[model samples]
Target: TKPLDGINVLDFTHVQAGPACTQMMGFLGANVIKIERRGSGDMTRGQLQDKPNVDSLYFTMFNCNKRSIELDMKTPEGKELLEQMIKKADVMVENFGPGALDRMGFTWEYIQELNPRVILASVKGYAEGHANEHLKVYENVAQCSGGAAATTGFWDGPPTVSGAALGDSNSGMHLMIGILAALEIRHKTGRGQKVAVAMQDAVLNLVRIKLRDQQRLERTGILAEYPQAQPNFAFDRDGNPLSFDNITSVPRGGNAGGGGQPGWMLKCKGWETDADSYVYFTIAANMWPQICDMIDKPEWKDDPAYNTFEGRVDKLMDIFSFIETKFADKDKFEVTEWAAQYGIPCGPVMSMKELAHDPSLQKVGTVVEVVDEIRGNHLTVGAPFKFSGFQPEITRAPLLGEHTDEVLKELGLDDAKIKELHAKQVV
Candidate 1:
């Protein structure tokens, strides 16, 4: 059976972060009941349009495998319904901005009082000591404040934020770890507790190399992982010490060594017309000789200037220069086929379209096709992880308040009480 087969999750979340956490829980077979706002529903409902009138891909993509319950928490009746749901749930999760929950009168203390055994989990943008004065936060903002922005991009160019929602998604992953750990703790303690994770904190935790430079500032030359020929060291205007990000800044005339390396996604011929004509290839130490031999440059395999890691490190520019010349003459398919024969580590960067059509991923059921009650059938990216005994069943994202009656009925409320709450605009 799934790890959390008997657990019930009350997902009182608005945006992506909290929903992502609950989605992971749902993947492990938890019964996730998502509580969305009335009328507009989740903010992602109409945000990014790929289909008309129906919920957007942004919403459906993240909220698979969950049922929905709509409620207008501003009303007294709605607040009562939420408290009742919380009391019956095994876990409660949310990611509303600071004070949003307390303003709705569902404070941690209140939630604990109502269901002492319910696991309370939350995802916030910042940890207590690091919260910005304005209390403002967003995906890119968190990455920037967490120091990821400083070390993300090419050394010569301004730093770039990740295309994915790393701040929110990473925080969700952290929350899942915390949630599972809290569950384990509850098994021994016989009670529930709060589990909190911050997006900025999560991002900071993911970027460890940036912090590594801080403590090693005095003793460090350039790290071996860096592609620069000369050792890198931090220094200030008066020749004291500076940070690694500042130290790695491209000197005006010097060619930034790591800036132009051989590791890249090579697009195949017909890439413009066909989606799958691309692959990522890396030339590491062990494969360098084989790569050179495959290209009929066997003589270079024995060349002292290109033989060892130190030699290649020193002459990476020359090495990649020759490699690029050869790559330009061949299509990605030819390159992949030729490299594979020599046991080279290479992969085609598959686009979402390519991934959906990929036979390998399809065989493993990594891509799922589901039919929404209103929107019909569509393919979605499935959750990671596999369980022989209890794999999750993929379902379409729920329509707003679609489960209101059923969920309320399951809570032991009679039709009369449900109708009374409906009359009061609670569900």
Candidate 2:
């Protein structure tokens, strides 16, 4: 049997965060029924359509393995229908604006009354008790609110947000954990409970390394691994010199290691023409002699200036620059392979184009080709978790309200009633 074979998820998630959580549950074998807005389903379906009227990759990629049903909850019949569905659901999830569900008469208290055993979950921009809990936040805004923006990017530039959906999809995954944790608690209590995760909280959880650095900076007055700690190496936007003495908070360190071994983003062959023609090379303290051999700097093997982390701190940038010279004519792959010979922690920066078509990732089912006959075939990222016994069977994203009648029938609605409801525009 599957991990969640008997679980029924009544999904009210629309965008990335909520949809992502429910879809992931679907992938894990939960029967997910996505309740959507009538006629317009998820906004993402038509927002960024690459092929005109077809579903956008934004929608299709995040929403596979779940069925869609359109319903108008304003109608009394629709409300009655939802109540029945709730009784059959193991969990109900939503990411609506503040008090949206309450206005719809599906508040937590009422939902529990409808189905005492059904778990209720929600996604929010901030935690419920936060001052900004009522405020709406988007992807980059949450990253900025979290510690990620303050500690990311280069020293001289503005705080940068990652291309990844740090706030949105990241929150969804956290809410998934919350919902699953609620399920485990239900096993003993014989009743489900409300669980919620905030977007800012999720981003903060992932950026805890920056928090560690801030505390360390408070005690030591300087972080030896940061670029600002290097003498006369870093500058401010106004071209003024930067160092730990001028910094109270953790300053951004572009491509620098956050903890442990020091590292830098170094150039490889074709770097002038290729944006991704670079490798991240780390200098572990124990690997100093091995690095010296690979870079043909045998003279530095026993030199006091280059043999240890403490000895190498002041001139770390200089050491990395010298290492770059050896790979000046070699491709990223060649440089990576050369570093591998010394058991070094060096990896080429992979571009989107390379990753999209990488056979190695496809072979392992990380990058999957979802066969959507309706919209034609497209590529997507599969489940990141890999279990030994089975893999998730990913299907295409559903057409808008594709399962209305089918889902209604399963809820014990007879054909005559279903026909009348559809005719009256309640579904």
Candidate 3:
């Protein structure tokens, strides 16, 4: 055994958020049965397809280790099969639009009447009673609505969304946690509870520090850590920086580190040719002397205008500019090593290609090769973490309705009835 070896999950989810959570449970050894429509199945099966007639990586990456049973829930026979599955399932997860499941007659009350021990988990764009609850949300919309976009990017540039799918995948991880908690509660009380994760709420929780800064701005009238609070950093008509009054609210600091310390993404030797050839390094007060030595600016360590944290805070642009010039001749890897030697926190900006092909990550199982029968061998990220006793097996996603007959048989449907349902496109 695995942690959830005996649990059964009725996965009525599609796309990124819901599938991500169910797939994680599958990785934990749950018998996840993904319920999809008879003909189209999950929309992502064909979305962003690189090869003709093959499942897209978008779907395969998030739906592994699970079985698929295609059912046309609009049919009476299909609804009956679903009700039977719900009665036997330990958990049911969905990310349909607001009230879609209820519209399909699978309301919480009906679900509980069928199986009081079944956990119902949901992923929605927003929580109920919110003004935008009915609006459809994608990744960037959630990021913007949740305060991430407003606080990201540069002080002089437009609001920018992060490259990470913080809204979708992160919300899925949050729902997974909630579902696991509900499972523990069910173990104690012999009852199941509803669990939910909203994409906007999840993104907001991840960026709570920005909310803290927002409250701080209300009292202090400035956020000193933000780039807009620095002196001589105001934008002119042409977008050039000049000295001006400090901003009242927090402003984007570009690649400047967001924590308490002063940091920036400095250019490295190959930056001109390689877009990601840079390293982000932070300088704490105690490490000023070491940083100065590394950058060949030892004299500045004692200079009154550039010696202390307070002094450096005022000249962040100038300081980072000087460091950028010094780092311009060195490779990012070399800079990373140099910083490590001095006990400074630093990391080279890695490209997706670099990370995907990293030998170290592959060795440690942070990345692994997955082979789909149709798509052949390709690489995908593996488990988020490893277990001491259990090694996860990353498997190919199921083809549409691949397990329909097998699952219907488990549901006590005979061969003749299964064939009739298949003929009616209700399996």
Candidate 4:
């Protein structure tokens, strides 16, 4: 009862971005046939291995629920096998370098000629016609190119890349959206079209709010909601006071809210030792009454400088500083509980060590524990979206070329030729 039960995906992606996309498609129940390199397979398979011979968590997490087939496309027989696979494919996805596919003998034109109904999707470092289109990109490079790193860290520090895979899996997710759209369009047109997503573009799309801050900063010369608006607060490495006047581009806002609400990342009780012991406390309008009541500052409720957004802009740091004092004895969860009772928009920073075994997330199937018979059982994230009647079953990622014989049989090849291809290192 899955949405992609009948869809066939010929996956030629090796690294994170494209693999992430097809793996999600696999999660959605697509028959994802992963084409791997003959020997080493995906680089991530051994890139950061925690255990010796088994596939790493980095590989296993991103490549679940897909069948793998090893093939050397450099061989003529391999190309023949690829043509057979592509003809049966409803979607062909790849993240090879620019011109790599064409060099390997299958151009987009030739692919369309083989199967016009099979959508061809490409994940690239940059968009076509861009000056840097040919340059290779990874996660951090895309983040920098897309303005994410430039506006991420503290103003006094070097730009920082996020721990979130904003440029890798994020791009893959965006590519999936484009691929899904193309599939929907194929119903009307009776043919598939080429779809492309650049990591830079995907990262840029997620950082659109930063661009909005840029626009507002340019026109108003000040982002009132940012920490720079607070008098004597933000300072540079040179020890000079930071204000909107000297700033041109949108600088990194440490933890200020961008959702039209003022907020700060406040330290909790264990913050002295626990690096992640903190909570983001947002100053929401609807919760103002509760905020005042919780802080026992009823007199400050009517005070002009302590109330409205504009009136408190210069005092936001001080206000948050005062708020942080109240949480000194409370752990992150306790602070969150207190805030919840007051209807404040606040939550604890759930660490990765905590997230992997969260009962609520596991119960809801968000954090799934895959029971792998080959490798030991491990946890991986499940599909974020839920359906009313449909449920996704996530299986372990395939071993290198595990399905070579099975897929060759499906491709109408007899046992003899399959043996020949295997001996020739072209399977």
Candidate 5:
């Protein structure tokens, strides 16, 4: 049994943001009943798929280990059914534009009236009064509007949105945090609370480090505490304008370095064996002198231009170029092993193809194979969190309204009532 084995979540969600939260809950053993419309179900099921009938990878990636209940809240009977479900549910979650739930007649007060103890969680693009005239916002827009756009990307380039849906995922995470906190409070108060997370707010919080820089920008004129001397503006890669690099560097703004200090990716032995024959290496500060010895540049240790932190800072590009030359000559694995002896940090960049065969990930059950009735079997990611008493199982995502009858039956509706709802097309 999972930690939340007995909890029931009424998921009135669409798209990635809200579903992301319920998915995490489902992973933790909650009985998540996804409530969708009667005809279309979740939009991502079709919108993000390659084939017409198959569920999209986008939907499958976010929604797993749950049941689906289709309903049309447009009708009085459907609304009644929803209210009943709310009464029985431990949590009700949604991510709709302003007044979407209210338009369906499920206002906070009405929900509280229906079930005083049910936690109501919602994710909005912006908080009340904060949404612009459009009244609609997507992940990128939310992050951009939230101040993340101001801090991300090269200092010289236009602010860029992150590839990851930080606006969506961060908001989902915030909603989850709020829900968990509300549940804990319910334990003592015997009452549920309303949990809401604005996408803009989540993005802002995720990019808080940028705010730190913004505050210090005037006083420090490009903070020196950060490792990279360059502001990391957009670069010309071959012919294309690439604003960001591959390497992870300190400070919040700019592209991460692809292969620099603590650089992990290296060319492996038998580079011809496969295109992915590479390893990553993490070179610790303490191993710097050892690296120098291996590169036959030990004499540089006492060279004032490369010896102290300030010296290295003043000669940043020179140091990087020297290290790059040494790394370019050695096989990735050889470098990794030698660096490891001296406590250097590094690893081979694992490609998706290589990741499919990684034994370490499988050994820890981080990868799971699940059987989807419609799409056959596919590999799914496993839960990242671990618990002593509870373990979560990977299961197929439910088809639209797959559990409609079962869930309605659980609400104590008889065969006659269900048939009536079916006749009315409300089920």
Candidate 6:
């Protein structure tokens, strides 16, 4: 049996963050009932559609393994039905803007009163009392507010946003951890508690390296690991120490490996035409000799000016330039294979297309093809992990209110009552 086979979830979420969390629970075999408005379901069902009159990939990719129900909680009857569902549910999740649920008359206090054992989990843009807590935030806003944007991208270029959904989807994963923890706590206490996660906080957690450097800067007043720290000294044109301290903060290193060892993205064969035809390789102190041999610079293996870490640090640009010239004519994949043989850590820069069609990922079920009656065959990323005893059954997302009648019946409502609710546009 699946881990959450007997659990029931009221998924009052839309868009990416909250849905991502609830769907993960659903994948682990919870009964997730997604509540939506009477006339419209999740807003994503119509957003970013590739095919006419069908759920968009944005919605389907995140909502799989859950049933959908329509309910206009603004109406008195709809509110009653929601309260009934809450009484029977083990968990309720929402990512609505701050104060939305309370305005709907379903405050955490009221929910606890209705079902003292029910877990109420929420995802918000920011934590209470935060400077930006009142502001509406999206993914990029979270990145910027969380220091990720300030530290990412090339040193000389504009700050760049990550392609990954580090704010939205990551917050969901963070909330998932909290929910699981709450479940375990409920098991011991026989009562439930509120679980909350903030998008900005999640982003900050992921960009912890920046925070580390921030502290380091206060101590040493410099960040030696960043590219801007090269030459180890800062001076004005007049040959005096620059007015500003040397490397006051961590400057973007443009794909330099975050670890202590020096690394960079080097262009390889086909780079002129393919943006991703590049390889990132790190040169550890111990791998210097082998890297020299691979790059046809074996003579440098024993050179006093290039043999040791300290010496190499001063000549990083020259060393990388030498390696870059050698890699220019080699394919990125070929370079990685050669690097692997010598125990040098490296990887080819892969684009979305490359990752989506990778045979290795597909073979391992990291990517899977799901067939939907309305959208036909489509590819999506599967659950990230596998269990030794249980494999998740991934399925297509439900259509709007697809399980309304069935779920209502299971809730002990008769056909006439459901029909009446529908007639009044309350469900």
Please tell me which predicted candidate would have the highest lDDT against the true structure: 4
TM-score of each: 0.87, 0.98, 0.96, 0.99, 0.85, 0.94
Per-residue lDDT of candidate 5, residues 13-93 (tens digit): 889889988998998989999999998999999885777789887788778888998898899999888878898899999
Worst 10 residues of 2 by lDDT: 255-264
lDDT of 2: 0.91
Q: Cα miss at 50, model 2 (Å)? A: 0.9
Deviation of model 2 at 236, angstroms: 1.8
How many clashes would you count in candidate 6?
A: 0
For model 5, the superposed segments whose C-alpha errors exceed 4 Å read 129-134, 147-150, 155-158, 225-287, 329-338
Order of candidates by TM-score, top first?
Answer: 4, 2, 3, 6, 1, 5
1 or 2, which is superior by TM-score? Answer: 2
Where model 1 places Cα greater than 4 Å from the true spot, the runs are 213-218, 230-278
* Full-model lDDT for every candidate: 0.74, 0.91, 0.87, 0.92, 0.74, 0.85
Once model 6 is optimally superposed onto the true structure by TM-score, how far is the C-alpha of residue 44 displaced, in angstroms? 1.2
Could you tell which candidate, 2 or 5, scores higher by TM-score?
A: 2
What lDDT score goes with residue 240 in model 2? Answer: 97
Which 10-residue window in model 6 sums to the lowest lDDT? 235-244
Q: Compare candidates 4 and 5 on lDDT and give the better one.
A: 4
Evaluate model 5: give its lDDT.
0.74
